Amino acid sequence: NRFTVAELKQLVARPDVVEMHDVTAQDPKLLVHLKATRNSVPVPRHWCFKRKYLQGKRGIEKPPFELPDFIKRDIDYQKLHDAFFKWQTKPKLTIHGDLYYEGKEFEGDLSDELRISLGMPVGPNAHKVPPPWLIAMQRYGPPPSYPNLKIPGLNSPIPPLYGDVFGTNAAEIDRTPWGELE
Amino acid sequence: PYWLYKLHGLNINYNCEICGNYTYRGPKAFQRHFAEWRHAHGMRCLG
Amino acid sequence: GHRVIVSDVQESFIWVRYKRNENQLIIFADDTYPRWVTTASLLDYDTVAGADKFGNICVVRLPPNTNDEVDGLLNGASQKAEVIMNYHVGETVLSLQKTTLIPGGSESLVYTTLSGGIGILVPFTSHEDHDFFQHVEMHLRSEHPPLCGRDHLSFRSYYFPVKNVIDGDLCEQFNSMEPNKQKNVSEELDRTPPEVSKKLEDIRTRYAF
Amino acid sequence: DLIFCRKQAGVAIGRLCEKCDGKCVICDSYVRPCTLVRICDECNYGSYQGRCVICGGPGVSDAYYCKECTIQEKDRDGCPKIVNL
Amino acid sequence: VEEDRNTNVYVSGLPPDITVDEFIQLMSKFGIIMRDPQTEEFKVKLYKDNQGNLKGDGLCCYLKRESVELALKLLDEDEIRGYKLHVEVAKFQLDYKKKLSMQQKQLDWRPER
Amino acid sequence: TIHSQLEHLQSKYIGTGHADTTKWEWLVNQHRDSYCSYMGHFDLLNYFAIAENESKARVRFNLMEKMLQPCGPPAD
Amino acid sequence: QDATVYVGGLDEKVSEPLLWELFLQAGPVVNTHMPKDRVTGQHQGYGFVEFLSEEDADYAIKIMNMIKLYGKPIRVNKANIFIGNLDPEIDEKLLYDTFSAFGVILQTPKIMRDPDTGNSKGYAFINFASFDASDAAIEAMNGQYLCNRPITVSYAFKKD
Amino acid sequence: LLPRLTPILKNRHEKVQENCIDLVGRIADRGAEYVSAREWMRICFELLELLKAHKKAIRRATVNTFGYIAKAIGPHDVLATLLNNLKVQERQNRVCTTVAIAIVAETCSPFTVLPALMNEYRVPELNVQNGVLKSLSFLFEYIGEMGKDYIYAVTPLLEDALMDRDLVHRQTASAVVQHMSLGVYGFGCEDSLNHLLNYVWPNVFETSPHVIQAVMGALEGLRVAIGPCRMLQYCLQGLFHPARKVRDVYWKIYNSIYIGSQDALIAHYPRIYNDDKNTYIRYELDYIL
RNA sequence: GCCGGCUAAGAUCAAGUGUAGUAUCUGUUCUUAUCAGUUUAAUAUCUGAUUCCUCGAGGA
Ligand SMILES: CC[C@H](O)[C@@H](C)[C@H]1O[C@@H]1C[C@@](C)(O)/C=C/C=C(\C)[C@H]1OC(=O)C[C@H](O)CC[C@@](C)(O)[C@@H](OC(=O)N2CCN(C3CCCCCC3)CC2)/C=C/[C@@H]1C
Ligand SMILES: [Zn+2]
Ligand SMILES: [Zn+2]
Ligand SMILES: [Zn+2]
Ligand SMILES: [Zn+2]
């Protein structure tokens, strides 16, 4: 006198929230309906486990505590106070429904260091200094995956190129916020 | 550790027709099999 | 011009984009709270002011990360909107409108209530005014408590906690206290009662009458 | 058997002894006493007239709820006198 | 060999009427005094003359080193009722796990009530 | 035994639940305190009386009459 | 494997987001994978870039072939003489054409591959027709300047 | 006067003690530049033991005088000494040291205490991190509203402590969360508090009584600081779970949420559809003027 | 934890030590088996029933 999983999956509007034990509830139709509310984070997922909520694996051995950047950069006067409140940034925060569990801690432009290690010189004023991957693009044609990309020599003019920027993506209102301090 | 045999869920076997009547072992493995390769293969048979 | 804002009877706000060349209406953002919306007002391209059947006003803004070009994570939309303001008014608001009331004044948010009341919410422009009015409210919450036994901070947090609103109807009760308590309040703000009165009148005459 | 009385509180003021003078009756905090404690009429009668609400010794000063308990409206339950059975 | 990690402190100069209990109070004011693991009787020594005469010098070993550096900057050049004490890192020149763990458990942060 | 007393006082308050609470009891509890909240708040009753075009005394009396058996009679 | 491109010849300056940033101009590289060694704990020079479409992987293989990245011959591909430290940009037909100048090859040469990626391991084996071609490869090709990679030709088996 | 006065602080009469402490406090408040900082350090370390007095006036005067001495000689040296003292002593002295750290951080803004205290959590040794956590707990409870500027700085440390296997770590982190929640209320700090609730909530299935007590306290503090709507959203899916353990825990949490703020919940309940026998929709709220 | 496994993945029943409290250690055993009832979200648990082979013995 109790539903089966496939039978209850046929009755509900949202079958992908139905689970193994959901057919064993006292009122599975209300349970599945509340599991589909447009909010309401689920249960911590370790209620059925047998390891007391602390997994003894995954190599938890690691550094004790990494202080924020603002921590490093009398002991310090109101000027270093000014520094601590100018450098203060908001850290990474999870939104309303992102519960923690034992496992979820581990799971046209080029950089200057890569350009220095690759042997590519800096961009001149008015000349042609392409990367070695640009000769194949000038010979075979533009890449179909990024048609809006511009390269100097083929689509962009030589005088463009400035510093380490060897490419620019050219994709083919009243944006000011209303109440803000001056 | 014959005790783990029955504590972890073994000696209780489940079968699935979508998977060649392949009989799976204790629930922790049985619940995971739907994501594994063999079940995807069996489901592709129907389309 | 680009987006559509939808009010649900029990959900708060849905953001939609109309694809002019594909002929598609796509939902790209929603909220994380149930709200019984009575009316809504656009403040700018990213922010919406809402009202409620239960007497609350809220302001909801899209995070700057928000991607408009879409083709659920909480049984909803993939991206969420943040609540940056919450206030309990005590009466049901049915009209919200951004406008300038006096010639040569500043823009305010005018609301209207089912009991016949009219009120405004005005933004602060500096941190000093905000801090001064915050301290006035703090000190008047204790030394001039509501008459019928209610906690002022708890009343403005009836359904949701207050967020970024100063109650100027509590603050203007300073002008009606007795001189001894007016001095006790003013000497903590490092000021005299006439200066506090002038500062209270300045922000009112800047926006409203 | 540390149980609160939880009866309808009256006009009688709660008292604290010399050992419990600064304490909060509900959470045992010492910071920011905020609200005066009221007790019922059976806790304030005859020999029970002046007594510590925490222990039951001779009272010397007023009992208070802390600001933390006042914010959560824990001063709205009944008589907070500790009674043993 | 052990340069630091020395939990022994040397009290140069003391009143010649010093008892053991006043001394162990003076020393317990600055932390936990290590106890001989086989027995009782905290590891405190009162140096004596060839007779009952009190030389006025004292040794005290501590559980931790932070208590030694505490006694260094709080007891040195401080007067008990009559005399001026001097405090210095002790100089030396010429069962276990059970009670070690107990003395450690004396620093616990366990739930009280 | 303070925790046990709390478990007895929480049960005492009307509207609290437990592991054997059914859907019907939950729903009639929220309907009943919804009607009481409507009777309490002055501008919600205004909204309803404007919506259905009735006097406020009539809406109050209708809510009080609905208080008795909201959600219909129970199961079995 | 078809949408992913195997890159070979990566130095210590190249990293896992660096290959995805360099391959972003060729196509939408969705993920980057770098297998770490067991003794050193770093990359072995070979990695993979999984893109969204196969045309982007083909354009990355045809654009970033035999490039000089971080002072290393980086090249993208579709995922008794012993030659060591060979460039991954060359194929079996290219190695047979390069070995045809010294002597005659008996058959098609073979290059060793990794059991995980399968693009290039680092060593190859080639057999000549006679011992004169092997001596000419050990005299001239053992130390010749290849495509940004100093190769080393040696004898696989020798009897004293 | 002052070196003649410092030996009287050890007298055991209540009036003598109170008057001596008040006099030393006045001297430190007005005549601070007349005696060396070393003697001030000795006097404060001696005053540390008077925070345990059985009498309330002694404790009040001691708090005042410690505040004055800390304001006088500076937070750095006294804070270093207080951390050393917190590391090595018995229970009551460590509790008094925690109170003293909170006093120093309130008189000299917590900006001057928080970095040195968080640097001590970096020591790879238990019973040192637990002391830092107890100090942070009492600090936030003691400063209250002043903490609104320092919640972002202690959030990663509380994350780390809530991911730890040690039970005292999580219990004390829950206590910190509770005091921080009740301290900032009406100041717009809901983001960090929701983030921290995401780490506090998985501990509801804990059997240890002290841990579950601290978790309930933190949940009731977040009910005030974050609002009952979020709490109901966390309880909805477990209210009717098939397992009786989940139902017991969730109904306890729900009853705690319901007894406080029963009225607000009216606007938060989810829609439940009518069945054949019974009507469950609340139709009045669907009216549209 | 190491390169699916090496029985450190769980429960239990007796005794010792000790705390304000949590606890810590030793012997164990672990059904290698089936059915019916209780019960558990499901396990678990508990409640009852159930000639042959080998070299005088052992195992099933
Ligand atoms: C967790 C720590 C422990 O519970 C510990 C307090 C307690 O376990 C010990 C035992 C015992 C008896 O030694 C405790 C000592 C007591 C104290 C240190 C408190 O001091 C007193 O009682 C003094 C007296 O009662 C009142 C002083 C007062 C008002 O400062 C009180 O603290 C406060 O109310 N605050 C905290 C808030 N703070 C700010 C500052 C701005 C304006 C004032 C209000 C807000 C003002 C001072 C006492 C603090 C000590 C914790
Ligand atoms: Zn299957
Ligand atoms: Zn309290
Ligand atoms: Zn008492
Ligand atoms: Zn009573």
Q: To probe the interface with A, which of F20, F23, F26, F71 has the most A CB atoms within 10 Å?
A: F23
Q: Which of residues 15-34 of A touch B (CB under 8 A)?
A: 20
d(Cα H101, Cα A119) in Å, to the nearest integer? 57
Query: Chain A residue closest to B31 (CA)?
Result: A20
What would the two tokens of residue F48 be? 């309803």
Q: Which residues contact H62 (CB under 8 A, 6 or more apart)?
A: H21, H47, H50, H51, H53
Q: How far is CA A137 from CA A150, A152, G23, G62, in A?
A: 11, 11, 14, 9
- Candidates H46, H41, H39, H38; CA nearest to H21 is H46
What would the two tokens of residue G135 be? 């001596």
Structural domain count of chain D = 1
The answer to whether H59 touches H47, Cβ cutoff 8 Å, is no
- Candidates A36, A34, A31; CA nearest to A14 is A36
The answer to whether H130 touches H94, Cβ cutoff 8 Å, is no
Between H244-259 and F2-12, two packed helices, what is the crossing angle to 10 degrees?
Answer: 70
- Candidates H93, H90, H177; CA nearest to H133 is H177
- Candidates E113, D63, F15; CA nearest to H213 is E113
By the 10 Å C-beta count (0-12 exposed, 13-18 middle, 19+ buried), A153 is classed as: middle
Resolution in angstroms, to 1 decimal, for this deposition? 2.7
The chains found to touch G (3+ Cβ pairs under 8 angstroms) are: A
Using the structure block, give the residue that is written with the tokens 């437990």: F18
C1' (I9) to CA (B8) span, angstroms: 9
DSSP H196-251: HHHHHGGGGG---HHHHHHHHHHHHHHHHHT-HHHHHHHHTTTTT-SSHHHHHHHH
Q: Whose CA is nearest to atom 37 of ligand 1?
A: H142
Q: Which of residues 155-174 of A touch C (CB under 8 A)?
A: 173-174
Q: Hey, is the C-beta of A142 within 8 angstroms of any chain G C-beta?
A: no
- Whole-number Å distance, alpha carbon H103 to ligand 4 midpoint, is 26
Strands A168-169 and B14-16 turn out to be unpaired
Q: Does the nearest atom of strand I lie within 7 Å of E111's Cβ?
A: yes
Please report the atom of ligand 1 found closest to the CA of residue H106: 40
d(Cα H200, Cα H163) in Å, to the nearest integer? 9
- Whole-number Å distance, alpha carbon D17 to ligand 4 midpoint, is 5
C-alpha E104, offset from chain centre: 17
CB contact under 8 A, H144 and D21: no
| Phi, psi dihedrals of residue C4, rounded to the nearest 5° | -125, 135
**DSSP type of residue D7:** P
Q: Which residues of E32-55 are buried (b: 16+ CB within 10 A; e: fewer)?
A: bbbbeeeeeebbbebeeeeeeebe
- Candidates D68, D58, D16; CA nearest to H56 is D16
Tell me the shortest Cα–Cα distance from A52 to chain F, in angstroms.
Answer: 23
Strands B14-16 and B22-24 turn out to be antiparallel
d(Cα H248, Cα H256) in Å, to the nearest integer? 12
Between H129-143 and H91-107, two packed helices, what is the crossing angle to 10 degrees?
Answer: 50
Instruction: Please give the residue range of the domain that contains residue D52.
Output: 1-85
- Whole-number Å distance, alpha carbon A37 to ligand 2 midpoint, is 29
CB contact under 8 A, G63 and A143: yes
Amino acid (one-letter) located at A11: L
d(Cα C95, Cα C109) in Å, to the nearest integer? 10
Structural domain count of chain F = 1
Please indicate if the annotation marks D79 as binding a ligand.
yes
What would the two tokens of residue A150 be? 């511009």
Helix (H, G, I), strand (E, B) or coil at H97: helix
What's the CA angle centered on G39, arms G37 and G45, to 5 degrees?
35
Please indicate if the annotation marks D34 as binding a ligand.
no
Instruction: Please give the residue range of the domain that contains residue F59.
Output: 1-76
d(Cα C44, Cα C46) in Å, to the nearest integer? 6
d(Cα H173, Cα H121) in Å, to the nearest integer? 13
Amino acid (one-letter) located at C4: V
| Phi, psi dihedrals of residue G7, rounded to the nearest 5° | -105, 135
Using the structure block, give the residue that is written with the tokens 């921290």: H196
d(Cα H182, Cα E64) in Å, to the nearest integer? 38
- Candidates H52, H72, H73; CA nearest to H63 is H52
Half-sphere exposure of A33 (CA within 13 A, CB side): 12
d(Cα G72, Cα G156) in Å, to the nearest integer? 27
Residue to mutate, H97, H136, H142, ligand 1, most ligand atoms under 8 Å from C-beta: H142
The answer to whether H122 touches A67, Cβ cutoff 8 Å, is yes
Q: To probe the interface with E, which of H4, H49, H84 has the most E CB atoms within 10 Å?
A: H84
Helical residues (DSSP H) of chain E, grouped into ranges:
20-28, 65-75, 96-105
- Whole-number Å distance, alpha carbon D4 to ligand 5 midpoint, is 8
d(Cα F73, Cα F75) in Å, to the nearest integer? 7
Using the structure block, give the residue that is written with the tokens 């073994």: B10
CB count within 10 Å of CB A110 equals: 18
The finding on whether H142 has its CB within 6 A of some atom of ligand 1 is yes
Ligand whose nearest atom lies closest to the CA of H52? 1
d(Cα B6, Cα B26) in Å, to the nearest integer? 9
**Backbone angle region of C96, left / alpha / beta, with phi > 0 → left and psi within -120 to 50 → alpha:** beta
Amino acid (one-letter) located at F23: K
Please report the atom of ligand 1 found closest to the CA of residue D28: 4
Closest nucleotide to A26's CA, by C1' atom?
A: I41
C1' (I23) to CA (H253) span, angstroms: 29
By the 10 Å C-beta count (0-12 exposed, 13-18 middle, 19+ buried), A4 is classed as: exposed
Q: Whose CA is nearest to atom 27 of ligand 1?
A: H60
d(Cα G76, Cα F37) in Å, to the nearest integer? 70
**Backbone angle region of G107, left / alpha / beta, with phi > 0 → left and psi within -120 to 50 → alpha:** beta
**DSSP type of residue G138:** I
| Phi, psi dihedrals of residue C175, rounded to the nearest 5° | -70, -10
What's the CA angle centered on D79, arms D78 and D80, to 5 degrees?
110
Method of determination is cryo-EM
Amino acid (one-letter) located at A117: S
d(Cα E8, Cα E65) in Å, to the nearest integer? 8
d(Cα H81, Cα H47) in Å, to the nearest integer? 14
Residue D65: beta bridge partners?
A: D35
d(Cα B19, Cα B40) in Å, to the nearest integer? 9
Amino acid (one-letter) located at G41: G
The answer to whether G135 touches G152, Cβ cutoff 8 Å, is no
- Candidates D26, D30, D35; CA nearest to D2 is D26
Helical residues (DSSP H) of chain H, grouped into ranges:
2-5, 14-30, 37-47, 56-73, 75-87, 91-107, 114-120, 129-143, 151-162, 167-183, 190-200, 209-225, 228-235, 244-259
The answer to whether H268 touches H232, Cβ cutoff 8 Å, is yes
What would the two tokens of residue C86 be? 């919450």
Q: Which residues contact H251 (CB under 8 A, 6 or more apart)?
A: F17, F18, F19, F21, H239
What would the two tokens of residue F56 be? 């406020």
Largest CA distance in chain B: 43
Residue C37: beta bridge partners?
A: C52
DSSP A9-39: HHHSS-GGG--GGGGGSSSHHHHHHHTTSSS
C1' (I33) to CA (B21) span, angstroms: 26
The finding on whether D30 has its CB within 6 A of some atom of ligand 1 is yes
Long-range contacts of A92-97 (CB under 8 A, 24+ apart): A93/H155, A93/H191, A93/H192, A93/H194, A93/H195, A94/H195, A94/H198, A95/C32, A95/C80, A95/H194, A96/A39, A96/A41, A96/C32, A96/C74, A96/C80, A96/H194, A96/H198, A96/H230, A96/H233, A97/A39, A97/A41, A97/C73, A97/C74, A97/H198
The answer to whether D4 touches F2, Cβ cutoff 8 Å, is yes
Q: Does the nearest atom of strand I lie within 7 Å of A24's Cβ?
A: yes
What's the CA angle centered on H212, arms H210 and H215, to 5 degrees?
110
Q: With helix as H, strand as E and coil as C, how does G13-70 read?
A: CCCHHHHHHHCCCCCCEEEEECCECCCCCCECCEEEEEECCHHHHHHHHHHCCCEEEC
The answer to whether A37 touches H236, Cβ cutoff 8 Å, is yes
The finding on whether D27 has its CB within 6 A of some atom of ligand 1 is no
**DSSP type of residue A154:** T
Helix (H, G, I), strand (E, B) or coil at G146: coil
The answer to whether A49 touches B8, Cβ cutoff 8 Å, is no
- Whole-number Å distance, alpha carbon D76 to ligand 5 midpoint, is 13
Q: Whose CA is nearest to atom 31 of ligand 1?
A: D31
The answer to whether H103 touches H66, Cβ cutoff 8 Å, is yes
The answer to whether H77 touches A75, Cβ cutoff 8 Å, is no
What would the two tokens of residue H125 be? 């040794």
The finding on whether H59 has its CB within 6 A of some atom of ligand 1 is yes
CB count within 10 Å of CB C138 equals: 13
By the 10 Å C-beta count (0-12 exposed, 13-18 middle, 19+ buried), D69 is classed as: buried
- Candidates C132, C117, C138; CA nearest to C203 is C132
Tell me the shortest Cα–Cα distance from D21 to chain H, in angstroms.
Answer: 7
Using the structure block, give the residue that is written with the tokens 């939808």: C6
Q: What are the helix and strand counts (H, E) for chain F?
A: 4, 0
- Candidates H155, H277, E2; CA nearest to F28 is H277
Instruction: Please give the residue range of the domain that contains residue G115.
Output: 81-155
Residues 234-253 of H with CB under 7 A from strand I: 242-245
Please indicate if the annotation marks D40 as binding a ligand.
yes
Q: Does the nearest atom of strand I lie within 7 Å of G158's Cβ?
A: no
The answer to whether E33 touches E23, Cβ cutoff 8 Å, is no
Amino acid (one-letter) located at A156: S
Describe chain A by its helix, strand, coil percentages, rounded to 5: 25, 5, 70
Please tell me which of the candidates F27, F33, F51 has its beta carbon nearest to residue H262.
Answer: F33
d(Cα G146, Cα G137) in Å, to the nearest integer? 13
C37-42 β-sheet, strand order: C37-42, C47-52, C56-61, C82-88
Closest nucleotide to G38's CA, by C1' atom?
A: I3
The answer to whether A134 touches A154, Cβ cutoff 8 Å, is yes
d(Cα C140, Cα C136) in Å, to the nearest integer? 6
Using the structure block, give the residue that is written with the tokens 């709220």: H285
What's the CA angle centered on C163, arms C160 and C168, to 5 degrees?
105
